[PDB]
Design a protein around this ligand. Structure first.
Ligand code: A8S
Length: 171
């Protein structure tokens, strides 16, 4: 199911990419009810409640579909700021899509789709999160390098999402 979407994206989808584009998917299992995980992920205006590298986020007006956020990130990264647009938010089906449309970083034409799914983990309510992205390969890099570096960032985000969710769940 999870491993299945990951194999389809890394193979079929990667086959569909432009030569200067790459794509992958990450799966994370989280020992918390879907309501808790979804309540964190859906907050387009508050990524810093679980994304470890976001220092600041500004949204003017309601964080509704089509809005923009400006995020500042912590020191130590090849970036200081990113402007991102909310492309999709479906509270009934639990799907979130974003596109990065500006900033001083190296990710051009980055789009992500994140979905959240209910499951059982050791006889308890759990949640599976799948996040997939497509992004351009910056000039002097390869698809592999770009994918692995972006994957590291998403894994940090989903691990932190899991930690926060499971902490909240134990209450
Ligand atoms: C942590 C970081 C480092 C960069 O080099 C680019 C950028 C500033 C966009 C970024 O916020 C990337 C965040 C990503 C890929 C996904 C997300 O947050 O859902």
């Amino acid at each position: 199911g999870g491993l299945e979407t990951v194999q389809y994206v890394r193979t079929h989808h990667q086959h569909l990419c432009r030569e200067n584009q790459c794509t992958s998917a990450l799966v994370k299992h989280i020992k918390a009810p879907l309501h808790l995980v979804w309540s964190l992920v859906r907050r387009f205006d508050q990524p810093q409640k679980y994304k470890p590298f976001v220092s600041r986020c500004t949204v003017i007006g309601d964080p509704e579909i089509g809005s923009l956020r400006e995020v500042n990130v912590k020191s130590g990264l090849p970036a200081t700021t990113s402007t991102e647009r909310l492309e999709l938010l479906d509270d009934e089906e639990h799907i979130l899509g974003i596109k990065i449309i500006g900033g001083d970083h190296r990710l051009k034409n980055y789009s992500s789709i994140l979905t959240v799914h209910p499951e059982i983990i050791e006889g308890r309510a759990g949640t599976m999160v799948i996040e997939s992205f497509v992004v351009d390969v910056p000039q002097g890099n390869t698809k592999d390098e770009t994918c692995y570096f972006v994957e590291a960032l998403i894994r940090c985000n989903l691990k932190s999402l899991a930690d926060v969710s499971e902490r909240l769940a134990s209450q």
